[PDB]
Design a protein around this ligand. Structure first.
Ligand SMILES: Nc1ncnc2c1ncn2[C@@H]1O[C@H](COP(=O)(O)OP(=O)(O)O)[C@@H](O)[C@H]1O
Ligand code: BEF
Ligand SMILES: [Mg+2]
Lengths: 93, 88, 98, 504, 107, 107, 93, 80, 95
DNA sequence: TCAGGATGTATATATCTGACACGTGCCTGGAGACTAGGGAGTAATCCCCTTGGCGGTTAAAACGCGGGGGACAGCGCGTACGTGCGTTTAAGCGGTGCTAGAGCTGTCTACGACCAATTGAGCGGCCTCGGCACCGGGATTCTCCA
DNA sequence: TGGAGAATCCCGGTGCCGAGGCCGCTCAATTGGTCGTAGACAGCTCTAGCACCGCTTAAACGCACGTACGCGCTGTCCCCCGCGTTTTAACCGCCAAGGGGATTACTCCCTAGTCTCCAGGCACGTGTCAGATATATACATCCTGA
């Protein structure tokens, strides 16, 4: 059966960052696990926020708040900046 | 004269007095206490409170409020893995 | 001659007293001022509930009592009876809070 | 009890049938049982047991009070302050002591600065009365309760506002004759613990006294009134909606006569102007001064939130501090040694005109009094008095029991060089007499204008041999102007009906 | 017309559509907004890029051209914020940071 | 017919209907079986009765007749299963178990 | 505004266990918090079980497994016994 | 059957060296064997609970990963 | 001969530089099967399942040994001891 | 203090190989388009609740000081732990053999969602007295120095 | 091997305030239908897990030997505890005054559901080169003796 992951996207990001560096299979699996784990943490926190405020819709504002709760210190500012930039560009075009 | 400026020295963290810290240690079961424990304890408490209050304020500000509520504090604690019973 | 107790007797008596009781051990106004001052660095002009401040104080005191128990264990481990900042730091370091 | 109820109705029903209407507007215990049967069917000589002379209106007030006593009905001595109402009370207690030959248990309540005055005057006039100032810590109150209060070795006892709250249980055991309540301003609230504990004591009579009548509302009015005759009213919103608040909707202004005629024999209020007793009025000036140029910058910093990184949770109080004085905000005084010089007066708006006025009145011989809300502002004034090296005495909230007395005496000592006298507002000006002083100045405005009037008339009483020159300070183009406007609003919301009370 | 993927029009590399699907099929809420997947994908891309550049630097310092779990471990544990984030995480075939206490070293 | 509550049918005291509603609106899965609320209510009742019994014994052990947070704390921290369960829980106004270390006491 | 809790049910259980003992108000608040917490723990564990096995229904089998995963030792055994007893009675009656 | 003794002395010394222990006592070995047995017992019991719930008869790597995650030790690299 | 404490430091550097496992595969596997024998009979393990157990166990023990070392230093020693292990686990709350 | 021997470790270079980077082919899941309706947003109103100051009491913190006992440093000794070496033992790798059981597909039915009507269990409001927390005296027990 | 002083417990009386019982109503829980799909169950395939054997060799093991370190003991001195006395700020009542959080009503636009279609992503080959592996030289570093 067809099983999916984030391998191709992680590889594209790698070729954007270090243009001539490869990555082994075990490391690739590790980073797949990392992306899944972070995704699930953020989504769970956003879900709990939305239920907390008796709303029934996860929006970019709940995602932003969950990011600010989970990520530590200087990481949070850059993360929210990247998210805001992406959403702004998406809506503008 | 020159008495209106004789008391400007609160420094709120000093509000956690030496006897209070000693009482806390006694409840913890400590028989004898060094003299440097007080400043160290004040630092530890300040860090703990900063973390909890940051989380509670984030929850509150997300909810478009201006009043930190007992529920917000409870959820901050629970998010830090310190569940608290008795405040709803 | 005045009647003085041997050092440690009053310490043990206080230990029994405070492990028997349950009231809060920090003065409420100083604690509330501290909480408000700390909050001032995150969002200006907040407004706490009394129950919120009480919850903060409950949690803080429970945390400090547990930390002092661990500190006592470390101090005993070093064959002392006097708790020291290095004992506190070891307790927090093992807990994973440093 | 019920016989007393019938006796009371003998005189209450002797007034209009409005008491019947109130009984019949209840939405009812057996008071109707004694009502139905009735429905279907002196000493004007200034008696000499006092040591002095009684004024004519004083004798009239004593007669009104003894009429209330014979009717076994209550009332309120709403006579304007400084009309010898202490003398009226002392002569009335002498009446109960001698004419009925009943000196028994009596209870009087006064503010802390004023516990001295009652004992001094009772000693000056009727030294035959056993009176205490029940002061001291737990133990000083302990032997006082144990020895004399338990020993029943007294006639009257003089206490403060809070001490009765502290000693309710050793005082409930003593059934009283009178619960004398000076300056009955704490009663305006029903949930006030003083009211909560004064519905508990059982005296044969309950003589409420005041310096000024109600402050804001018919609500306030019945809040005071309920503790006079409670078994008669025992009702909360009936009294309000029955009168409809000065015809709040139709503005008839004629139904006020019902209330006013009910209270006219049920209250006794006189004015200083009618019966002078001093033959000299008081002047009043509002020294509108500009808000200081230097603190203009910080006032902008407060308006636009520009110094920074500080709390502003009560913009009212913050702006009010700024309007009072700049240096209260913890840092306007840059000097690491905290210089004490003409820079203070230069930087504070009011103090320049104040220094001019002080230089004037020192030469003019005016003996001045100053009132304020901020004890810290009084600290700054104390430092500035040190700068000018004037003699004075500083009474503030929480000074002492004895030190209040000794400072008052030092100021009121004959030929006292104490030119100024620093005082707070809500702790200082509630009944003391300072006729040795003549001029009273307010540093700030208070959201209780009736309290302000209470304040200015400290020196404007019987014994004032000079013209009272009032100089209120109001800052121009400041929120204190709106303070004054709302103050005038609340003055007129009450004083029109107060003036209608006397006429009809 | 001709489609243009949401990832492309947001300027990302991670799949916005896949994140949208996972959010909907994950029972996180009754409804899912339209900017939630774009935001979340951008954040995930940022974190991935961060770890990747640190691991690439480590591998280059080790004179290798491929990234391995050892390099991921070194990057994560040498960056203090990432270490705080992944505090309760074990990386398979990771190892430990080289570290000896001072008192043990000879004098 | 005649209404008879599911809690009564199961022979419980806790509200099966309320628990079923809470499982429904909690977004835990897409569907909720019919025996899940009954099972969950039975479990919650068992745990509640267990702690209440222990705390009642603790309260009677101090010659009291009303249970207070100190009594709850004593029961929980003295029973080892419940101590393991509520290991991360702070009970407000609960206090601490009396315990002085072996070497601190006078010899 | 209505606010629902577990007061009456905790009280009925108390009267079954200790027929004459009372209970204060703060203790009742604590018991309410305890019941809510245990509910949430069990329900979340059952949710993730169902997701792991690619099911879309929370059944008594999921609840039983979640109890067995959360409660320690004798608590797990007796809780399983009680839940099974209740479900059997519910179906048979 | 004395399988815990299969965790030999040199293996424990290697683990200690990686942890940074310069000098090791002699009683450490039984203590560490007991610690390891307790840890394994907890993790395997949770893993077998997941396996038995799935109505399988083979313990998969995902069951171990889930059990570790439940106890709080997330493990990256063995699938998802 | 090397003085005591030299080969030990050399081994410290070597094993902190390395990455592989440190316990023998088959002994660990037999241990795992024996332990699981007490919960359900006749299980069956995936090789990756057993490898995951080994990775987790070794990581756990290494971290525990770091904490034990800290306690030993705290008592002014260089020799870890059973009571050091017990103190570390008690502080972490595994007791 | 240093010298020289000895041992382990890094640095350099030549050779395999199997793990990764890349190309093909296909199919399924994401994008485009369109509709309905309900959740979220906005306005207006109200009333409780948070804040800041003071007033006055009084309990707790602050402060000073003698002294004793515990932290700490040094010293000796004796044994337990590290280092090395030869012998044994079992791990690791390979190979062959077999089958349980994991994983998938197909059918169909029974169970859960949803809706509408009904009713009664639980919630807020209201009253009342008994459990509990002092408060004082007296009695007992503990600690400490003889 | 002791009484004397302080702490603590015993017992009864008192005031209070919150736990517990009653009551109206409303909204959530139950009862009864219809309908659609999740999953229970059968049957098939073929992967991957279990079992055993043979051979190599690297690690584990048992023992010898020596010294470094743990631990006990002693003395010293400094710093914490105990207690008495003075000062300070905590604590509760009180007074205003706004503001912010909840409620209520209405509206609209943003998301789910449905359908169509095609290209992005996944499974499957394939070559090849980065790393693993094996040797050889260089150098650092430890250790005993001078
Ligand atoms: N009839 C009188 N004869 C002499 N002096 C009087 C008389 N009435 C009042 N005074 C003086 O006027 C002052 C008013 O004091 P007091 O009676 O206390 O006024 P109040 O009771 O209104 O405060 C007193 O100090 C008293 O000496
Ligand atoms: F006239 Be009284 F002293 F207020
Ligand atoms: Mg008078």
């Amino acid at each position: 059966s067809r099983k999916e992951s984030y391998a191709i996207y992680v590889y594209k990001v790698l070729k954007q960052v270090h243009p001539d560096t490869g990555i082994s299979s075990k490391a690739m699996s590790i980073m797949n696990s990392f992306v899944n784990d972070v995704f699930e943490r953020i989504a769970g926190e956003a879900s709990r926020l939305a239920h907390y405020n008796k709303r029934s819709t996860i929006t970019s504002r709940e995602i932003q708040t969950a990011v600010r709760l989970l990520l530590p210190g200087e990481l949070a500012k850059h993360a929210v900046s990247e998210g805001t930039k992406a959403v702004t560009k998406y809506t503008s075009a | 004269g020159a008495k209106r400026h004789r008391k400007v020295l609160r420094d709120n963290i000093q509000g956690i007095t030496k006897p209070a810290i000693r009482r806390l240690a006694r409840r913890g079961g400590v028989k004898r206490i060094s003299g440097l424990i007080y400043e160290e304890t004040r630092g530890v408490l300040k860090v703990f409170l900063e973390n909890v209050i940051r989380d509670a304020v984030t929850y509150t500000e997300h909810a478009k409020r201006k009043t930190v509520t007992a529920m917000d504090v409870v959820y901050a604690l629970k998010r830090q893995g310190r569940t608290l019973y008795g405040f709803g | 001659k005045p009647h003085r107790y041997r050092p440690g007797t009053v310490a043990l008596r206080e230990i029994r007293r405070y492990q028997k009781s349950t009231e809060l051990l920090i003065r409420k106004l100083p604690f509330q001022r501290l909480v408000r001052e700390i909050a001032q660095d995150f969002k200006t002009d907040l407004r706490f509930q009394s129950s919120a401040v009480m919850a903060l104080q409950e949690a803080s005191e429970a945390y400090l009592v547990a930390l002092f128990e661990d500190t006592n264990l470390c101090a005993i481990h070093a064959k002392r009876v006097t708790i020291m900042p290095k004992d506190i730091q070891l307790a927090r370091r093992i807990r994973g809070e440093r | 009890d019920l016989e007393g109820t019938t006796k009371r109705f003998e005189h209450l029903l002797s007034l209009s049938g409005l008491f019947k209407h109130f009984i019949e507007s209840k939405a009812d215990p057996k008071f109707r049982q004694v009502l139905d049967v009735l429905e279907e069917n002196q000493f004007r000589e200034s008696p000499a047991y006092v040591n002095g002379q009684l004024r004519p209106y004083q004798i009239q007030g004593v007669n009104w009070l003894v009429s209330l006593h014979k009717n076994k009905i209550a009332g309120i001595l709403a006579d304007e302050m400084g009309l010898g109402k202490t003398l009226q009370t002392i002569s009335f207690l002498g009446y109960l002591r001698y004419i009925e030959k009943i000196p028994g248990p009596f209870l009087v309540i006064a503010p802390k600065s004023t516990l001295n005055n009652w004992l001094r005057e009772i000693n000056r006039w009727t030294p035959d009365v056993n009176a205490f100032i029940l002061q001291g810590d737990k133990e000083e109150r302990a032997e006082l309760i144990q020895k004399k209060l338990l020993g029943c070795d007294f006639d009257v006892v003089i206490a403060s506002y809070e001490i009765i709250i502290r000693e309710k249980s050793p005082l409930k055991k003593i059934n009283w004759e009178y619960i004398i309540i000076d300056e009955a301003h704490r009663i305006k609230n029903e949930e006030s613990m003083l009211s909560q504990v004064l519905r508990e004591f059982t005296s044969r009579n309950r003589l409420l006294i005041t310096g000024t009548p109600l402050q804001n509302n018919l609500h306030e009015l019945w809040a005071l009134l309920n503790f006079l005759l409670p078994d008669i009213f025992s009702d909360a919103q009936d009294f309000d909606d029955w009168f409809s608040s000065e015809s709040t909707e139709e503005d008839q202004d004629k139904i006020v006569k019902q209330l006013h005629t009910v209270l006219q024999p049920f209250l006794l209020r006189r004015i200083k102007s009618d019966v002078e007793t001093s033959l000299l009025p008081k002047k009043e000036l509002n020294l509108y001064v500009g808000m200081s140029s230097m603190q203009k910058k910080w006032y902008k910093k407060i308006l636009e939130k520009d110094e920074s990184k500080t709390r502003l949770l009560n913009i009212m109080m913050q702006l009010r501090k700024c309007c009072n004085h700049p240096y209260l905000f913890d840092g306007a005084e840059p000097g690491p040694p905290y210089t004490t010089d003409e820079h203070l007066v230069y930087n504070a708006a009011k103090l320049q005109v104040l220094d001019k006025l002080l230089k004037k009145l020192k030469e003019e011989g005016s003996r001045v009094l100053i009132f304020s809300q901020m004890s810290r502002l009084l600290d700054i004034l104390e430092d500035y008095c040190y700068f000018r090296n004037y003699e004075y005495c500083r009474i503030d909230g929480s000074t002492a029991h004895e030190d209040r007395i000794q400072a008052i005496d030092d100021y009121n000592a004959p030929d006292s060089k104490k030119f100024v006298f620093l005082l707070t507002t809500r702790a200082g000006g509630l009944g003391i007499n300072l006729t040795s002083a003549d001029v009273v100045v307010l540093y700030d405005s208070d959201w209780n204008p009736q309290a302000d009037l209470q304040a200015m008339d400290r020196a404007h009483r019987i014994g004032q041999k000079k013209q009272v020159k009032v100089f209120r300070l109001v800052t121009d183009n400041s929120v204190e102007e709106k303070i004054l406007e709302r103050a005038t609003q609340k003055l007129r919301l009450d004083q029109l009906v107060i003036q209608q009370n006397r006429t009809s | 017309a001709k489609a243009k993927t949401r990832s492309s029009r947001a300027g990302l590399q991670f799949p916005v559509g896949r994140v949208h699907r996972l959010l909907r099929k994950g029972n996180y809420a009754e409804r899912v907004g339209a900017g939630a997947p774009v935001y979340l994908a951008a954040v995930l891309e940022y974190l991935t890029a961060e770890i990747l550049e640190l691991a690439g630097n480590a591998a280059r310092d080790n004179k290798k051209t491929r990234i391995i779990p050892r390099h991921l471990q070194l990057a994560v544990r040498n960056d203090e914020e990432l270490n705080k984030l992944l505090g309760r995480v074990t990386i398979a075939q990771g190892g430990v940071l080289p570290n000896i206490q001072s008192v043990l070293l000879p004098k």
